[PDB]
Design an enzyme around this catalytic site. Sequence first.
Site, short mmCIF file in Angstrom:
data_model
loop_
_atom_site.label_atom_id
_atom_site.label_comp_id
_atom_site.label_asym_id
_atom_site.label_seq_id
_atom_site.Cartn_x
_atom_site.Cartn_y
_atom_site.Cartn_z
N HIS A 183 0.81 -1.22 0.00
CA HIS A 183 0.00 0.00 0.00
C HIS A 183 0.84 1.27 0.00
O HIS A 183 0.26 2.36 0.00
CB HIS A 183 -1.03 0.02 1.15
CG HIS A 183 -0.46 0.26 2.52
ND1 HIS A 183 -0.36 -0.74 3.47
CD2 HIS A 183 0.03 1.38 3.11
CE1 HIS A 183 0.15 -0.24 4.58
NE2 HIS A 183 0.42 1.04 4.38
N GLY B 212 2.80 5.76 10.13
CA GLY B 212 4.17 5.64 9.69
C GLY B 212 4.89 4.40 10.18
O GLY B 212 6.04 4.18 9.80
N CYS C 5 4.01 1.29 9.47
CA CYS C 5 3.90 0.15 8.57
C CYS C 5 5.27 -0.25 8.04
O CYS C 5 6.16 0.59 7.86
CB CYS C 5 2.96 0.44 7.41
SG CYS C 5 1.32 0.48 8.06
C1 LIG Z 1 1.00 2.25 8.23
O1 LIG Z 1 1.90 3.24 8.67
C2 LIG Z 1 -0.38 2.44 8.87
C3 LIG Z 1 -0.32 1.90 10.31
C4 LIG Z 1 -1.62 2.24 11.10
C5 LIG Z 1 -1.80 3.71 11.21
C6 LIG Z 1 -2.44 3.95 12.59
N1 LIG Z 1 -1.94 2.76 13.44
C7 LIG Z 1 -1.45 1.72 12.49
O2 LIG Z 1 -1.01 0.68 12.79
N2 LIG Z 1 -1.27 1.64 8.05
C8 LIG Z 1 -2.44 2.20 7.42
O3 LIG Z 1 -2.75 3.34 7.57
C9 LIG Z 1 -3.29 1.27 6.52
C10 LIG Z 1 -2.98 1.60 5.09
C11 LIG Z 1 -4.31 1.32 4.41
C12 LIG Z 1 -4.37 2.09 3.06
C13 LIG Z 1 -4.89 0.86 2.36
C14 LIG Z 1 -4.74 0.05 3.61
C15 LIG Z 1 -5.29 1.96 5.45
N3 LIG Z 1 -4.70 1.52 6.73
C16 LIG Z 1 -5.40 1.34 7.98
O4 LIG Z 1 -4.80 1.08 8.97
O5 LIG Z 1 -6.79 1.50 7.97
C17 LIG Z 1 -7.32 2.02 9.15
C18 LIG Z 1 -8.52 2.88 8.74
C19 LIG Z 1 -9.75 2.43 8.94
C20 LIG Z 1 -10.93 3.30 8.54
C21 LIG Z 1 -10.75 4.48 7.97
C22 LIG Z 1 -9.32 4.99 7.75
C23 LIG Z 1 -8.29 4.25 8.10
#
Ligand SMILES: *[C@H](O)[C@H](C[C@@H]1CCNC1=O)NC(=O)[C@@H]1CC2(CCC2)CN1C(=O)OCc1ccccc1
EC number: 3.4.19.12
Lengths: 306, 306
Positions: free
Chosen positions: A41, A143, A145
């Site tokens: 992603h 950040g 990930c």
């Molecule tokens: C990577 O840095 C991030 C890790 C997350 C952020 C907050 N705590 C974490 O562990 N991953 C991340 O944002 C992923 C990336 C996708 C984009 C396609 C998959 C979205 N996502 C995620 O965590 O979704 C959470 C979410 C749910 C509902 C609405 C918006 C975001």
Amino acid sequence: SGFRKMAFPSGKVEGCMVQVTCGTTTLNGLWLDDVVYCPRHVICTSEDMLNPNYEDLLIRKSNHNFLVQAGNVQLRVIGHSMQNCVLKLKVDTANPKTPKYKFVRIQPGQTFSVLACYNGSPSGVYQCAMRPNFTIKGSFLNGSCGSVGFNIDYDCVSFCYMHHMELPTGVHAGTDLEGNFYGPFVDRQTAQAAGTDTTITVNVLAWLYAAVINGDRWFLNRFTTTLNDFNLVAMKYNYEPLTQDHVDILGPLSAQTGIAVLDMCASLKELLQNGMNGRTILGSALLEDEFTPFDVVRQCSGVTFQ
Amino acid sequence: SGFRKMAFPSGKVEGCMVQVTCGTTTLNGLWLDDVVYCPRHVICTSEDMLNPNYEDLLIRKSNHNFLVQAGNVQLRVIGHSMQNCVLKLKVDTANPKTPKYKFVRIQPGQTFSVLACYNGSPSGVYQCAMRPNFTIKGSFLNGSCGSVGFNIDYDCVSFCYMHHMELPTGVHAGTDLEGNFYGPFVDRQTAQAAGTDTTITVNVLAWLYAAVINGDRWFLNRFTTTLNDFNLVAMKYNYEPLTQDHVDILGPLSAQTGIAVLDMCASLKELLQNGMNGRTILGSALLEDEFTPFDVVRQCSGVTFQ
Ligand SMILES: *[C@H](O)[C@H](C[C@@H]1CCNC1=O)NC(=O)[C@@H]1CC2(CCC2)CN1C(=O)OCc1ccccc1
Ligand SMILES: *[C@H](O)[C@H](C[C@@H]1CCNC1=O)NC(=O)[C@@H]1CC2(CCC2)CN1C(=O)OCc1ccccc1
């Protein structure tokens, strides 16, 4: 003596962490030999992420779109490919700090260490278990990930987890290092939810043995139970079934303490039915289930790693 | 989101760990530039340890009595001296992996990471707090002495603890890196005992803010209290007094959550008087006191280290 949630020394993994930037997205990558592994992603943007087609998105990218930073040194990307939910960026430099490693997939109930990273820089290390519902109860911010989970066996690092996302209850989901998710989660925006969890019975028993080894004995009793009668109680309190193989795995701890496994099951039964009556075990007022029998033996005996 | 007991990445410290053997005793040393630091009770033997005279014992030693192993490489000892309860072995090779470092002494209530080691080889890493009674609740077995505790501030390692001994309640005592013990303990065999401990109030409040940041709010209330009225309750439950400086240190967390410090004190008051009623906070059924306000801000905001 003493019993702590203990991670593996993280140095061997720190030397593999890099920063990957594509477009507006920056996350972490794992640099082993001449490949950098990272979540796919990274090729997404804030409107791609609702329901992306990663094959379409990837053929539109160029090697030079991928900015890889190893500290203050830029790594030239000379090729890219997708493997399930991870990206493999081939770079023109092999990581001279590559440890001996394996890519392993772990079972629910097993533990691992997580090296939380931001901008390719390690932030902290902590111990996690893979829950029965294939989530992990991590500590991850934007950040994070591409941060990885791992175990170390003498000198060999077994990578088992790469972080991809947070679920709505605040727990975390990710993949093995071949890019295959743990559990029924996808790297998209949907209404994904964890799904019901259970308590890891064999681990609770291992921790009770850890407690006995460390001098906590108030929960011991003269009663015993059968495996079948115990499992009826486990069912009722949302504990997973105890198998004969679990009993066998607990053999060494049983022999060291002189407490038969089924006798410790009887103690667990009373703890589940009566609670703890204001008392604690190894500094906890809850029954702890994120230590495996291996974790207990390693800590209460003193295994190192070179 | 999520909140874990998190240690610093241990790689910078792993590169300093060596094995020190004198006579029948093997323990760990810390190798920085051309000096190896280790506990002075390495010069003791099983009848020396009851009530030794270390100055007498040390003048009887030779450089060649000290066997120092850096992995599979032997370091030539070219001088030795005693500094309080540590030994300083001068070796003919400076450690090329020496990080930027400081020797700092910490306050009760502060936290640090411990790299548990055996035979000069790192075994595990975990987070500790210095208790009000100057012990630490560690996880240490025979051969762990000379393992160190530390914090990392960007790229600088602040060493604050070297392990020396276990007390009869299973807690641990040691020194700063100048060889001065924390608390009223000595590196001898006497009937040393910890002495009464208290709960680190400011840390419990920081953890409650961590909980709010992470969505645990059931313990919040509309009541408030004065600092003086809170401290009367703290006294009764063996909590240490809360000062105005503690209130000030909690300011940022207060502002981020919109919960006045004294309002969180009122919540703590009710938790102390009522208990938790079968409920949990950040996965604990006890009030947790080994996270500082700094620890909470670092984790709930995402600070890294290079
Ligand atoms: C990577 O840095 C991030 C890790 C997350 C952020 C907050 N705590 C974490 O562990 N991953 C991340 O944002 C992923 C990336 C996708 C984009 C396609 C998959 C979205 N996502 C995620 O965590 O979704 C959470 C979410 C749910 C509902 C609405 C918006 C975001
Ligand atoms: C160092 O490896 C060892 C660490 C201990 C061992 C068990 N868990 C630990 O943390 N230290 C150690 O054994 C020190 C060394 C002295 C010798 C002079 C000081 C003894 N000691 C200690 O921990 O004393 C405990 C003790 C109390 C009563 C009788 C026997 C030993």
